[PDB]
Design a protein around this ligand. Sequence first.
Ligand SMILES: *[C@@H]1O[C@H](CO)[C@@H](O[C@@H]2O[C@H](CO)[C@@H](O)[C@H](O)[C@H]2NC(C)=O)[C@H](O)[C@H]1NC(C)=O
Ligand SMILES: *[C@@H]1O[C@H](CO)[C@@H](O[C@@H]2O[C@H](CO)[C@@H](O)[C@H](O)[C@H]2NC(C)=O)[C@H](O)[C@H]1NC(C)=O
Ligand SMILES: *[C@@H]1O[C@H](CO)[C@@H](O[C@@H]2O[C@H](CO)[C@@H](O)[C@H](O)[C@H]2NC(C)=O)[C@H](O)[C@H]1NC(C)=O
Ligand SMILES: *[C@@H]1O[C@H](CO)[C@@H](O[C@@H]2O[C@H](CO)[C@@H](O)[C@H](O)[C@H]2NC(C)=O)[C@H](O)[C@H]1NC(C)=O
Ligand code: NAG
Ligand code: NAG
Ligand code: NAG
Ligand code: NAG
Ligand code: NAG
Ligand code: NAG
Ligand code: CA
Ligand code: CA
Lengths: 437, 437
Amino acid sequence: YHVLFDSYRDNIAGKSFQNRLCLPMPIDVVYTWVNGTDLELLKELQQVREQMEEEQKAMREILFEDNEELRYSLRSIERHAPWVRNIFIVTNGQIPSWLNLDNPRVTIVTHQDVFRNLSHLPTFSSPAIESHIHRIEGLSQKFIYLNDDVMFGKDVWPDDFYSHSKGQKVYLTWPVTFADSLRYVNKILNSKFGFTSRKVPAHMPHMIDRIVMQELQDMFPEEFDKTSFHKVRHSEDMQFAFSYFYYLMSAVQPLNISQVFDEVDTDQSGVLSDREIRTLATRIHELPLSLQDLTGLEHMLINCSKMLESYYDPNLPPVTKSLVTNCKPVTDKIHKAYKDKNKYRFEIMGEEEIAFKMIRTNVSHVVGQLDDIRKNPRKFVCLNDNIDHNHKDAQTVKAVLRDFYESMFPIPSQFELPREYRNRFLHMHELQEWRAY
Amino acid sequence: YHVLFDSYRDNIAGKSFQNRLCLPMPIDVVYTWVNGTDLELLKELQQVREQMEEEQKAMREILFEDNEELRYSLRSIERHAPWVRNIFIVTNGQIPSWLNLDNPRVTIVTHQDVFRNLSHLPTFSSPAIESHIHRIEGLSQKFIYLNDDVMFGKDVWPDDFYSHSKGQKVYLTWPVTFADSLRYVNKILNSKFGFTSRKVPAHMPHMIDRIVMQELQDMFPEEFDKTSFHKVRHSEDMQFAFSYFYYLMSAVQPLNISQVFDEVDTDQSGVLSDREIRTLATRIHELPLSLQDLTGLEHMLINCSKMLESYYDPNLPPVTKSLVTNCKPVTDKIHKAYKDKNKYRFEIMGEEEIAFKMIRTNVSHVVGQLDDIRKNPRKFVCLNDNIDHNHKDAQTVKAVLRDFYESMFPIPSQFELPREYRNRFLHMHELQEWRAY
Ligand SMILES: *[C@@H]1O[C@H](CO)[C@@H](O[C@@H]2O[C@H](CO)[C@@H](O)[C@H](O)[C@H]2NC(C)=O)[C@H](O)[C@H]1NC(C)=O
Ligand SMILES: *[C@@H]1O[C@H](CO)[C@@H](O[C@@H]2O[C@H](CO)[C@@H](O)[C@H](O)[C@H]2NC(C)=O)[C@H](O)[C@H]1NC(C)=O
Ligand SMILES: *[C@@H]1O[C@H](CO)[C@@H](O[C@@H]2O[C@H](CO)[C@@H](O)[C@H](O)[C@H]2NC(C)=O)[C@H](O)[C@H]1NC(C)=O
Ligand SMILES: *[C@@H]1O[C@H](CO)[C@@H](O[C@@H]2O[C@H](CO)[C@@H](O)[C@H](O)[C@H]2NC(C)=O)[C@H](O)[C@H]1NC(C)=O
Ligand SMILES: *[C@@H]1O[C@H](CO)[C@@H](O)[C@H](O)[C@H]1NC(C)=O
Ligand SMILES: *[C@@H]1O[C@H](CO)[C@@H](O)[C@H](O)[C@H]1NC(C)=O
Ligand SMILES: *[C@@H]1O[C@H](CO)[C@@H](O)[C@H](O)[C@H]1NC(C)=O
Ligand SMILES: *[C@@H]1O[C@H](CO)[C@@H](O)[C@H](O)[C@H]1NC(C)=O
Ligand SMILES: *[C@@H]1O[C@H](CO)[C@@H](O)[C@H](O)[C@H]1NC(C)=O
Ligand SMILES: *[C@@H]1O[C@H](CO)[C@@H](O)[C@H](O)[C@H]1NC(C)=O
Ligand SMILES: [Ca+2]
Ligand SMILES: [Ca+2]
């Protein structure tokens, strides 16, 4: 209503500060989903055969099952993060069988649109898909990247990914074919932004800015092409969390002398007075300010005018922006005092709202981990499903995981086709674990 | 426009989350201003005479100048915090000579309206005025209390006082007639909320919630009346920062068993399943969860039904809210596990954006402190004006302080009457300090 619109101009200034008070909206969610079908497995087999043939030629020169983790992740999106505008899922050409495509808020984005160089799209490698989400048409400027196995909890909010005051929120972990990529990107970033002891980010829903990601891609045009070229995840490729966040944390912005002059000129009258010249002297020199420093500043100023509301020294000309921006000694001292800032703001937190649990084929340990998740709910829950799949305790662990998923998120979502009539997944395996224990 | 209103319902849920995304608005600012006029000084003299007479009767039973710091503080309000809706100034009956009362966004609130017990209002004591700001009519639910000597800087935002996620922001200082009040309130709070090693808050613009302050007043009805009764700041009275913040940080909310049942019942169907009973067992007991604990939980549940979608134990009745909320052992274990939470959220930071500088009659030291303020601007700047006023270096320090004020905030505000024509305050005292140095 009009009163709500006119209530943001009810302040003393009379302006509207929606852009500084109402968070970045809209925010979208991007998923990467792959299915273990026969055709895709055959294509992978052909690609591996080609890889082996290439290795043989080089040496001659010398001479399956998913625990429907997308369904529950989408349910978590709808339940805990209901402020998401649209949901994008990137797939080869595959559409989930349970996905309700009639919903306008869910879209399947194939690899034709995502990839730029259409001689690359049979790509079968997660970093290559990860390279080009920011090129999705219709995607909001800030979007959250979900990895199809990470879920939500405790009713997350956009305040958990970005803040207008402290910028994006970076969640880091243990210090630094996937560890090789981390080492390679560490070397590449040390080459550009200098050597720094770096940690690696956590596996969790990552908020990504399209402008920042595009700037990162433009900064390394050749290297991101290697990531896209490789049709199997290589030792040398650029990641998603590590590359984006550390470019965000090490983006250097050159000093704007006009900004210094404007922040000092409180009158906004173009000319500086003795008080503003004195605050220049304070910000430039090191405290305490001896009058020698201020007299030297005025001396460098009177020199420059000769080469190119009354002040105490009668010989000092009116100090406009042109004098300070053209006087080399003053600009040199300004650069030496105002050294390089950071182009992007960021905030660093620990692993306190992140649940990365490792599921290895031990029903007692799996139940223990899931009970730990149940007792203390956490905002970001990730469950890596590396079950042996050839073991006496594979179906039992799958049943335990599905029971945890159905306990956390039981209600079917709006993105799911009307289904699961008489589905009745095995309800007796978890009872077998109960009876054995 | 309507698209802006309909853009908050563009999410997947279809609802509007303005109350969780756009910060608490509106926010007001409250000032306490006193003038050293002849009539007020005479009234103070009469009150002191009465105090001496009372002391004499008890033993018989045994037998001036302000550096216009409100002007510059209001200028700082307009420049650095332009999101304030209205500004309230509480005075005895005094109106500042420079205040533009024709502005609808500035109001003088006398002591008639502020005080509840009109036989108390000739009160001449800062805590007594401080007691009853939350009773100002038209005041917003969250307001900022300015002490007429604290200013702003670095373009403060409502994010610097309150966050929707971590609650109000508490700025604390060195651990604990004003120190006596701190000790007394520490004793009173230790009596109610138990002994705790407490720090004292900083002198800075304090954001105050009227509901929380009213709850604090109701919690100690007798003690806040002593604060209001005393017509001179006494050793025993309740402060503003210390009393409010520590009640905020030690407000205990009793456990809501219905909340536990609702957070566990993911189906929201009223009845719990084996998975939800198991997450109850995880949250109640201590990990790891032996099946003995879960069987005991079901045993306490089957007991209670006798005294008052199939589960593994055939004897367990449907577990609705009534069973768990009426079973004494289960509620006892829930209370023991879910011990007392805190009624209000809060966040703790250090003295990093607070400038409390002490001005004592040494021109070199005053200039050093003001240069330190100039070199590193800080969000909250407080300058205590305890000049000797009988010294060879009083006018010089006043001129230095006024020059700092006019350098920081030179532009006349909207709350100031059109004035200061040919005012020309002494521009030669600071030059005398320059020449002496
Ligand atoms: C993932 O791929 C599987 C095949 O691996 C597909 O499931 C098939 O669906 C068709 C219907 O179009 C059936 O005729 C086949 O019998 C199914 N095969 C199997 C092995 O179940 C489907 O495209 C995808 N399934 C899921 C659950 O994502
Ligand atoms: C599966 O996990 C359980 C723990 O959940 C393992 O039990 C451990 O057994 C060793 C000795 O066998 C003990 O020293 C540990 O204290 C046990 N753990 C706990 C938490 O008590 C069990 O060994 C694991 N089984 C396999 C095959 O790895
Ligand atoms: C504070 O009180 C002073 C008096 O201490 C007042 O200034 C007086 O203003 C009247 C005009 O109504 C003049 O006739 C007097 O000569 C002034 N006295 C002095 C000592 O200046 C005024 O009410 C207040 N002044 C300020 C600056 O707040
Ligand atoms: C006023 O402050 C200055 C510092 O701003 C004082 O100068 C100090 O003098 C003592 C000895 O007299 C030295 O040990 C200190 O190192 C000086 N301070 C600095 C920062 O160099 C001066 O003494 C003060 N004057 C009075 C009267 O208190
Ligand atoms: C990418 O496209 C360019 C021209 O658009 C082409 O020369 C190059 O070979 C492509 N990269 C491949 C096919 O890996
Ligand atoms: C930064 O510098 C550019 C050109 O040098 C100028 O257009 C811009 O206004 C400056 N930013 C400010 C003054 O905030
Ligand atoms: C420039 O200023 C310095 C003082 O910092 C002075 O010594 C020098 O003589 C000036 N330059 C000229 C050409 O006079
Ligand atoms: C406060 O008001 C009550 C009645 O409203 C009165 O009895 C009491 O004396 C008052 N307190 C004073 C005058 O200090
Ligand atoms: C807290 O308890 C009260 C009554 O005991 C109830 O009305 C309210 O809904 C509960 N809060 C919840 C369920 O969030
Ligand atoms: C209540 O349950 C306990 C098991 O925790 C059991 O020992 C006891 O017999 C039950 N009460 C009755 C009256 O049977
Ligand atoms: Ca100026
Ligand atoms: Ca249920």
